[model samples]
Target: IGDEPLENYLDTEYFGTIGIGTPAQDFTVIFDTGSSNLWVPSVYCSSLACSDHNQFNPDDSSTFEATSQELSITYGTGSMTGILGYDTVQVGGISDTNQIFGLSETEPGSFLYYAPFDGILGLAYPSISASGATPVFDNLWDQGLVSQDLFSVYLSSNDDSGSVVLLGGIDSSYYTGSLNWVPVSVEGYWQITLDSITMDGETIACSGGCQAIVDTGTSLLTGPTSAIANIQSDIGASENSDGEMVISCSSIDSLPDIVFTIDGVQYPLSPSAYILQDDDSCTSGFEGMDVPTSSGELWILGDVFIRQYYTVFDRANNKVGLAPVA
Candidate 1:
């Protein structure tokens, strides 16, 4: 019932629309793979961030069930706290009942405020869900809403509507050649072992065998600070005092292509795609992300890397598939 089509919003984030409740109250959220839990800004949210978007009003639904279970999720930038609840979630004409979710109360920072979507629909494994609630996709499978426990995503370039997320099976028309399936190194996230990373043949962006998470929640193709700094220097990108790599619009074409090697296959990024251009200046898609507890030590192949390949997240088979875009 669902490659649910994704809509790229300003190249910063991509989201898909979903209906909730009996009457189907509308809210679009990022179909994220980095975490699990279906959350939305509820009518009870105290933070001003919730004022601008659609908030799920439990009172309007006949099937809504309130829970005393508390929930919270922290990101690299901010955090959100809320109450756990359950309701009917309808996606792609398939409705699953009693889908556990979070109704936000305290929106700690402005990270979500600027997000174009109303909330996040986490697609990661349930083990990582902070609320300990069953993920939306899991409920879809348990309720026999879909034929398969897998989904595929096609993220378009910034500014168009070609992105999609398929729920049951893969559409061969979406990608070219054969799909390269790689088993997940870790079960918590869509973590995979990245064989190597090459800039101009070889810099070994990833020193040796390293873990990489394919995260749809993040906007940039980031990695550990020192490792990406070498790439920043190699690309002749300007590092602002704030540490963000800035590139001159005139030099985008001259920049060397950065190719990523995964499962012995080479995928090269076009310069224009790697360096995101705003209005006047452009920024390098590769940035420094040194996170706490060594979690961020690994690499992140965000939308910047994903837009070039059609990806498949297979939970039943426990592997990820990637194929060059057709």
Candidate 2:
């Protein structure tokens, strides 16, 4: 119904503010489409990661109701252990009463400790939710808080502003051309069928069609270790002493694009979008990780890819939409 402005932190993290419970305790949270369930640090947490971030106190809200149900989630970068509870949740311009969410008692990892955002607000389907809690987006639809059953995301570049998570509707100004619609290959994730991975009209990775998840929580564009290694070698990236695949800052301009094909449409990631230009060095945005799902080995289209495209996750039609950023 409204545009929730997100802070684009170093072009690596994107998060927005949300209110929980009555009188509204505000917390900056990632509107993540990778996993399900909304969770934030709680007063019960004793970890150092929780101490530095904002914590929600149940006693502060008159509408807060506690439950003993346990919750646990392990993400690509971090993990959390918590308990389930019910309260009013507010994001953008919508609110859901009696919404189920997690209050993290332990966030065990270095990832969340220095993360600019406080917690995660998962936008995936309920089938993948931890502890069987209803996802915030589903609750929004069930409670009739949103007019539409879809949400769109626009991740801005490091130098740009106007990054946002548009709930319940699409904003045409953020993108160019009509959206290319791809059917969801799986319901649990924003999963779609990818045709191939190619460069210079020749195949690189994903010689055969593969399944890919459009994830907003993830920072890097990742695939199987072997395939990504092929990409790294083709792109002329060498592993540094730190074990990170890096490229010469001078070679950035001459690097060829790595194009991704989906539903017969080609979405090319230019070198500018796939190379991270730090102070004196450049890092490759593609990472190698074998994420095994029942469907098969899945590829992740993360921020590196999203920054070049505006994405839409539609529950009504069970499809994913992509368009070039304006």
Candidate 3:
């Protein structure tokens, strides 16, 4: 089976190396389930963001083919627009012919310029793709290049531990016990209904039955402003200059486990992995990121949750599987 280990990029993001084109020029990209379409900086890009990272030179690849089409995608604070092309894209032991991808000739100056990864390799479904391009994972599935229509992610809690992205299969060593599979709540994203959020056996947040997205792209746990405010105050934290809640590092351990109930199962995140520590101070991982969907507000259980559980994205069954670590 095809498998690739992921590296923790500054404890904020996880990325893996991917080979593109016939000559196999490698680029490190963020494997995101929050978006669709794979993209990388191109040599034709004149933006300063492209200069610092590995750029895809189409001319040097023998298997490169251009569709001569253009596309654009807007982000929360920035966006990217570029031309379209096809080439041989390889990830771990899986490889595909004529894989569709974007070549960013232009990118946002501020957000992406200082970003650690070269570009994003979206693992989400094709419906959310800005350019309507088929995602690389689906292409591999369609061509029978993968053993299974699935993938798993193990985002490490710290740099000292391990992390990985298993393509077409699962890694049993990263997690303990059996996987607790939950049905997908929405069509576009890995949205699942969070039954309730509890602290000390009482439902603290998401009391109204909220929806949560299993997103690895985001670094922190994101929720609505109101619930997050209550959670921060209960944990004896105050907002800092950066809008992130600051908690006393000395008292972090005393904080109780924040339990999130999903599909009749309870998942807990200890205070250590739930808070970002820097010397004597710590930042609350939960913040404001409300996506107004049918579920009222969308809560993103990002890296904060994955670091505690081995997560699998099952496309074949349209489900998300989570298992606690040993």
Candidate 4:
């Protein structure tokens, strides 16, 4: 199979299992497209976060090789200190030998402690990789393990069991219509030009244009505080004492869809798709973060957006393809 079946955790995170070394030690990993680095908790880590998750034991892996180089990577919510190592990496049945990956010595954060996945396999370009390590996807292509330099992601909702990340090529059965390709504005992340954020035929944020990253690692759609504030107000959502954007569950049906204009095409996200519902408490899927790039403000289209559209990351062409899910 060219696909890795993913488990959706409360519609917030999607992860799957992968074999990291010979004898096939399985580890649950997030196939993250927001960054470039493959890392896993190791037996050397003393942190509570590492103890709670599965750790790699170099002694047990026959193909494992080590390096003296150290690695440190920080994400939006967590950070890790690790060492470099080369091992056999298996993804969706494809074997990549001599793949360099990180073995965590320290994972300092509550985020990783409570995380469902044991590790993260970054799928972004190698330019953003920490310690100049080649990404897993790059190694796959270099080793000729994949049929193409592209991969497609399909994320289902909380009720569906059909989510998967298909490596190497696209499967037409998962999407409908034609694939719309958008040129990558930046090679670092999966960055692109977002034309505007519209709601009910009216623009709410990113009025003219903005830089956006199509990030699968992130759970929610995020942007600058002011821009997100505008949309929250437009959608009649109010922030609670806990600083969470809340709305009455009863009002969901009356709320309008937020349309994102990308590459001259409009992609509408319905209220049910953007609003997280847990019985009575409803929260907006759009969070606010002030991430500024040299070109402009950087907005993140995370799972909230990806859950509605099938995303194709094309490394060979340096482009992204979007299509409505079937």
Candidate 5:
């Protein structure tokens, strides 16, 4: 995203122990660059899943406020049906005023409504509306509180500390390797063109093709059915405990790196980028976090792919940058 301070919190279970429920399990949030509006589940919902996970309570905090209107959102994965309220969300020592928050009165989703976390903190630029709406990022940007001109994010399914979404700017601490910037097309959505995909430095077969949309809002990586199969074949992975094609966790350490071609340049990702933790033995598997679906035919470059590159959501340019973390 562009100049937003992401809020990072300790990784806790999505469900809380409080009988009345509490805030969602604390975790880092990107203030998502793609979507507008901010929402998090509130503790007042009577839903069965809401009672276990952490839910927000506006009345508990002095900084909290309320809104007269209610809001509801349905996702490709699930829905967050709830009442819209206002609150002061604290991030990076900055507090947003009159911020629109979601207090779910009811929900019917599989992951989001039940998954850990209070709710999402959307940092998209359009969210900064004067219709009595204040985006979480704009509030900080207006105050001249930004830490960088551009922000980058990388998320991992790995339960380790590496599953993080950096804000303000890309972490210079990581490998400052060479970057292969890709020009984005400004049409249907902020999408990027993929020239090709290589496994272990070898080209593979693609079915519907590799054109993809770089979306951070989605949690997994999705692509054409054949493209996914080609990648799996190249790795010699097997159907794992998760029922998805997977490779041995230890194999990733020695497996050849996967390369992505954008424009004309090549961007290489570490083998660990494709491996995910599945069991207590530390055995890794290719759980197909970005697998094929029957819904539609479009490649979705979700967090799994974004985590490997220092992504710059350039709203002003109407394009996005996929730079190596240098």
Candidate 6:
């Protein structure tokens, strides 16, 4: 069953204002759901990439505070090296006071350091918290400051429509259907095993071969290239002028229904959910972008898939559950 909706206010790509004791300064952040941690680059970093972002300056804030412990973050892209500190992070009308976060002192030249965002706000399951630290969400939950028990996320592969993560609970106004619950598996990476996948109500080939891992941390949906090709071909999606997998943004409205079968239950995905409008002139169809170079025998259902459903990472039960927004 779906838990109570949580009110999450973190926005997708752009930066927000944060400070310890003074007025918050605008800083870019990536609200990530794969892992649980809060890290940002500091003004002291000297790397060229770090120069492009709005760095955190503790000295500017009257309430800014620091800790003796050092903190660092290592990701698939690069690492954020810093010292542990406390500051006020303000975003979307939610202000976390003296929040325990990271401040990078050295630049690692990683993609996060170069991106428009200055830090990352992780919203994944509590189990994925950074080493030697408590989960940020859990800390918030324990403080009795939020308004809800459920968190909802909506990410569009499209440009900066900017993904959203609702903290305390989901806004019921955004959804228009009943909730469908699916039991999760107890295994690797908080993954829920999917039984099959279908295009337009027709089941694709694969008897014992269909399986999917529900992961919020992953940015893209990855599966067998052949399977992806079949789905894309059937949908009439085309390669863009830039050689990227894309379809006419307008055509997205007429795209066929995509479904995921989990333990014999069918979960539907709306057209607009998969076809993302990157900009006024460009769009990216969630079919196939990156292909695996190695022979890994697994399919990952990433944000592209989770956006269609309200997911729960129930660490207490060692299971993940999916329910349609009610």
Lowest lDDT block of 10, candidate 6? 1-10
Count backbone overlaps in model 1: 6
Error of 3 at 317 (Å): 0.7
For model 3, the stretches where C-alpha displacement exceeds 4 angstroms are none
Instruction: Give the 10-residue window scoring lowest on summed lDDT in candidate 1.
Output: 289-298
**lDDT (10s digit) by residue, model 3, range 1-326:** 67777889767888888999988999999988888879999998889899899999999999999997897988654788898899999887677788999999899677788888899998888889877898988898989988889999888766744688888889888889899999998868788889998889788888868888888899888898888888888777897788667888866769899998899999988888888887666888888866777656778888888889999999999999999975
Q: What is every candidate's alpha-carbon RMSD to the true fold?
A: 1.7, 1.1, 1.4, 1.1, 5.8, 5.3
TM-score, cand. 1: 0.95
> By how many angstroms RMSD does model 3 differ from the true structure?
1.4
The 0-to-1 C-alpha lDDT of every candidate, in the order given, reads 0.84, 0.90, 0.86, 0.90, 0.53, 0.59
Q: Give the local distance difference test score of model 4.
A: 0.90
Give the per-residue lDDT of model 5 (tens digit) for 100-190: 6556787665565445454555545552332335665556566665665344564433343443344455565543654445665433334
What TM-score, over all chains together, does every model reach? 0.95, 0.97, 0.96, 0.98, 0.71, 0.72
For model 2, how does the per-residue alpha-carbon lDDT over 163-239 read when each residue is reduced to its tens digit? 88988999998899999999998898899998999989899889878989999888999999999999998887899
TM-score quality measure for candidate 2: 0.97
Better of 1 and 5 by TM-score: 1
On the 0 to 100 scale, the lDDT of residue 218 in model 3 is: 90
- What's the lDDT for residue 117 in model 6? 54
Residues 226-272 of candidate 4 have per-residue lDDT tens digits of 89989888877897898788987766798888888999998889998
Each candidate: how many clashes? 6, 0, 0, 0, 13, 17
